[PDB]
UniProtKB/TrEMBL annotation, chain B:
Mg(2+) 1 binds at residue 65. Belongs to the universal ribosomal protein uL22 family. This is Ribosomal protein L22. PROSITE patterns: RIBOSOMAL_L22. InterPro entries: Ribosomal_uL22, Ribosomal_uL22_CS, Ribosomal_uL22_euk/arc, Ribosomal_uL22_sf. The lineage of its organism: Eukaryota, Fungi, Dikarya, Ascomycota, Saccharomycotina. Mg(2+) 2 binds at residue 129. It comes from the Eukaryota. It comes from Candida albicans.
TrEMBL record, chain C:
Belongs to the eukaryotic ribosomal protein eL31 family. Keywords: Metal-binding, Ribonucleoprotein, Ribosomal protein. PANTHER family: 60S RIBOSOMAL PROTEIN L31. This is 60S ribosomal protein L31-B. GO terms for molecular function: metal ion binding; structural constituent of ribosome.
Length: 63, 172, 108, 386
RNA sequence: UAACGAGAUUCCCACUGUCCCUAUCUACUAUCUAGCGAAACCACAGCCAAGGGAACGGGCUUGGCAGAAUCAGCGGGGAAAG
RNA sequence: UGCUGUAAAGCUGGGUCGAACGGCCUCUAGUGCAGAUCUUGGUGGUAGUAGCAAAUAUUCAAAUGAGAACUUUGAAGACUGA
RNA sequence: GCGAGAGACCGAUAGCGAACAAGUACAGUGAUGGAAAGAUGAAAAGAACUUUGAAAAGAGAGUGAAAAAGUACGUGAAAUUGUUGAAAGGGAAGGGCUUGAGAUCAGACUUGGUACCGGGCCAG
């Protein structure tokens, strides 16, 4: 119900900003149980946590 | 505890209290006077319609420089208002008093609000900051609320006697 | 009386957002569609599909389309003690053109 | 000390207070003075302001630079379907003023005039005048006696007439009911004339002829709360004035130690009752005529309406009055037309006007065509024409 | 006395709502609502005219008069406040 | 609730209350308040009034919860712009 | 300083600043400056239990000599405020004098004497 810690830990573990962390809306209870970085890594491996793609900055117009 | 007014027959009455309630004294006084002496069900429906902005609470004493509304025409006023927090507090107290009356075996449909009053509770102090490094008061004006629900020779002179005797003899 | 019914409407949002503050146009279109659904369905309980929210905000805060084609369904709100036995669910309808379309009862 | 320089007062003290009018229907404060030898005739009529247009005319004023030359003039169109007479009122002279003795109504009243007696018509049982109509059924002797009362005692007789607002494009269904004084003949003649016109229609042409100078009573356009600068036309304070400049700088001297009634103040502007006089009648048009906008010099078969309709009014499809210039009120406003209160023999009052041409281009923009036919001729075929 | 100057001043060109003479538009207020909620100030108070009077009265004398409760504004007076 | 005294004041009926107090003859004083922009504390009118308007901007749905404009998640729309 | 005994002294805004976790809390860079605040009850017996409510609480109940003593606690004034009852009200209110009206209070049938004697009050 409050996944603030989980968002922060996922950002640290995955190596991206908090803005690029996706916590599964439909798996709230399991994510709320993930208190350690190890549980976060397990969720990341199984796709419950996902690294969002970068916002594209194409250089085609520049070239 | 001592209530300000005591019912004539306590077996047909139920009471409720709230003390040190952080709700405006002035708005609460207006809302308490709006339903004083009403049937309980009539008052509850009216308070629900107040929370809907379908009817308003008439503001009779604490109303200086408040707005005007056409929903005051029901009560013959132009200044009326919809104080939601006071209405919610009064509804909670009416519900508690109704529960007490039910526990005493009383009939809800016959209940009338026979007594209700609002008193000042002790103020709660906060601070506000003014220009030129000054400190002013920023206080609350809390309420004490109580309410009660109730089921709904001639002696004559000698000359006067003589006059009456003469008159009675004259008419048979 | 058919309580459960689905119809497709066209709302003229251009004339409803006339003169509106530019940073309130998309938020007011949300309120306008809710008032539109209550006018046609008779329910103050109006629910907007998140895809409708995406369509409203597609072109930013003041980029609302002149006309939107909407599917509105009146459905039973059993959910006892809810102040409304019915409710309206509003979702977008993808069409090639938003002109010339009339109110149509949708069969399911 | 005295004002350093002299200037006239801003605004007129004779139109005070500048408050909202009590009713939206402008009331006739005074009627024309009664002349007994004249034929029995109405003195006023109620219509609806529809809009403005343009005319072209030859001027007939010898000695003017524009004598026998064309002038372009603004005109106002008043939608005036016929009124229905539904009652009569008798007035008696008293040392305290005129007092109405009694009122007699017609047997049948239309729904539009009976809608005038209701604030919530759809929730009502429509009982208005339902027991009064029984006063006719038996033998109408009560009605005859009331009319005999009016003949015996009244010195002023006015008729009760209402508009047929359902003939206008207005979405309002309530008819406007007004008293129009009856002038000419004796009181008995007046009561007879009113009785014979019960439930009947009377048209504008039976009241106002063409070239007549008439008065208009209406309520002006509302503006809400206005500051002194526009309400009274006072001078704006300099640009660098602290706390603003759309103000009157001095609202009075130290003594009298009170703000005087003659000082300009912010307050409600417009929506006032006005009686404007001397508006010449350029045309009394007929609703049946399909060449209302046509003239002897411009023979296009044309109605008075402009292309697209009068903006925010609709189309004038009844009798109408074309008036020189502008009159108080707005589009849709009920306006009262009254005969002149004096006899005027100036050249402008007695001039016969002959309209060359009436503009019927669109009022919704820079309209450049007078007719759909002219537009089609100028533009040729279009894609939508096929 | 060349050069320099957020220094004082006059004229000129350009410019323009500074003005003739004002109009219209936008955002935020004001406004109305829910919640929250101060301060200055306060003998008692609060409609005018004249008189007399510490010689410019809300009160006193003589007149004019005088009808609940009020909202938005306003800057005449309270010889308003500081 | 009444009574006495010109008065300062004194006595008494009723209610509240819980541990000391008074009359008379004298003694003694840090002995009587409306004021001192008095002191300290408390409380009003003002007044539900002024106001809570800088820094572009929020929205839909789900979860939680007695309760969600403001918490969390998802989806968007934005901004800081090295 | 240490140990004692006293008073025509003060009695919680008094008496030392401090009767209390007082030179404390707090302020100032610093030297320094420096408060407020005593009392349920004999005894916590400090309200078990039931019920309404999300809860705070309320209503029953209970303890107590007293809850008109409920750890917002001895008594509990005034300013100021709510409710109830009575009354009054055309640009202030209040006051004196006087009477009316409405309310309240009071007295001689006496500490009365043996049906009478005799007395009190208001009046002709
Ligand atoms: C509960 N609040 C605490 C409390 O301990 C409070 O106590 C007072 C207490 O002193 C009062 O009691 C008082 O009794 C007398 C008399 C005037 O009442 C006073 O003279 C005396 O100073 C004082 N003890 C008492 N009546 C109410 C409590 N709240 O005193 C301090 C405080 C922080 O406010």
């Amino acid at each position: 119900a409050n996944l603030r810690t989980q968002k922060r830990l996922a950002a640290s573990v995955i190596g991206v900003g908090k803005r690029k962390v996706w916590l599964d809306p439909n798996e709230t209870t399991e994510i709320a149980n993930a208190n350690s970085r190890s549980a976060i890594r397990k969720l990341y491996k199984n796709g419950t946590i996902v690294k969002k793609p970068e916002t594209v900055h194409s250089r085609s117009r520049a070239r | 505890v001592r209530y300000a007014a005591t019912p004539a027959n306590p077996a047909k009455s139920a009471s409720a209290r709230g003390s040190y309630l952080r709700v405006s004294f002035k708005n609460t006084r207006e809302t308490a006077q709006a339903i004083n002496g009403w049937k309980l069900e009539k008052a509850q429906k009216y308070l629900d319609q107040v929370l809907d902005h379908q009817r308003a609470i008439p503001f009779r004493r604490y109303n200086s420089s408040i707005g005007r509304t056409g929903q005051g025409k029901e009560f013959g006023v132009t200044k009326a208002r919809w104080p939601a927090k006071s209405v919610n507090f009064v509804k909670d107290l009416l519900r508690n008093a109704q529960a007490n009356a039910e526990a005493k075996g009383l009939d809800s449909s016959k209940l009338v609000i026979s007594h209700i009053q609002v008193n000042h509770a002790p103020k709660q102090r906060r601070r506000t900051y003014r220009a030129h490094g000054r400190i002013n008061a920023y206080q609350s004006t809390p309420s004490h609320i109580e309410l009660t629900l109730t089921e709904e020779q001639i002696r004559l002179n000698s000359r006067q006697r003589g006059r009456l005797a003469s008159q009675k003899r004259l008419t048979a | 009386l058919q309580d459960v019914v689905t119809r497709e409407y066209t709302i003229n949002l251009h004339k409803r957002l006339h003169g509106v503050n530019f940073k309130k146009r998309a938020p007011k279109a949300v309120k306008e569609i809710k008032k539109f659904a209550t006018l046609h369905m008779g329910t103050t309980d109006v629910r907007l599909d998140p895809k409708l929210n995406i369509a409203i905000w597609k072109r930013g805060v003041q980029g609302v389309e002149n006309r939107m084609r909407l599917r509105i369904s009146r459905k039973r709100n059993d959910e006892e003690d809810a102040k409304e036995k019915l409710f309206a669910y509003v979702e977008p309808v993808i069409v090639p053109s938003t002109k010339g379309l009339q109110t149509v009862v949708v069969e399911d | 000390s005295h004002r350093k320089y002299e200037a006239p007062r801003h605004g007129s003290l004779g139109f005070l207070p500048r408050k909202r009018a009590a009713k939206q229907r402008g009331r006739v404060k005074s009627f024309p003075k009664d002349v007994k030898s004249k034929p029995v005739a109405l003195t006023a009529f109620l219509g609806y302001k529809a809009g403005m247009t343009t005319i072209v005319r030859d001027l007939d004023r010898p000695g003017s630079k524009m004598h026998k030359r064309e002038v372009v003039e603004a005109a106002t169109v008043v939608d005036t379907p016929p009124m229905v007479v539904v009652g009569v009122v008798g007035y008696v002279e008293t040392p305290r003023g005129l007092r109405s003795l009694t009122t007699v109504w017609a047997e049948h009243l239309s729904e539009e005039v009976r809608r005038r007696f209701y604030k919530n018509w759809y929730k009502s049982k429509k009982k208005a005048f339902t027991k009064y109509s029984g006063k006719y059924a038996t033998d109408a002797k009560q009605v005859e006696t009331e009319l005999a009362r009016i003949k015996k005692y009244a010195s002023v007789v006015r008729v009760l007439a209402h508009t047929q607002i359902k003939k206008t494009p207005l979405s309002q269904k309530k008819a406007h009911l007004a008293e129009i004084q009856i002038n000419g003949g004796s009181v008995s003649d007046k009561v007879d004339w009113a009785k014979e016109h019960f439930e009947k229609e009377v048209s504008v042409d039976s009241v106002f002829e063409q070239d007549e100078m008439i008065d208009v009573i209406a309520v002006t356009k509302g503006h809400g709360f206005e500051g002194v600068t526009h309400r009274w036309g006072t001078k704006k304070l300099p640009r660098k004035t602290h706390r603003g400049l759309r103000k009157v700088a001095c609202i009075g001297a130290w003594h009298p130690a009170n703000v005087n009634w003659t000082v300009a103040r912010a307050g409600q502007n417009g929506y006032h009752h006005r009686t404007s006089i001397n508006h010449k009648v350029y045309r009394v048009g007929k609703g049946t005529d399909e060449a209302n906008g046509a003239t002897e010099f411009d023979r296009t078969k044309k109605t008075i309406n402009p292309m697209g309709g009068f903006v925010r009014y609709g189309n004038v499809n009844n009798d109408f009055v074309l008036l020189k210039g502008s009159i108080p009120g707005v589009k849709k406003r009920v306006v009262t037309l009254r005969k002149s209160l004096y006899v005027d023999t100036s050249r402008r009052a007695v001039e016969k006007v002959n309209l060359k041409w009436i503009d019927t281009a669109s009022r919704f923009g820079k309209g450049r065509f007078q007719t759909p036919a002219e537009k089609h001729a100028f533009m040729g075929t279009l894609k939508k024409d096929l």
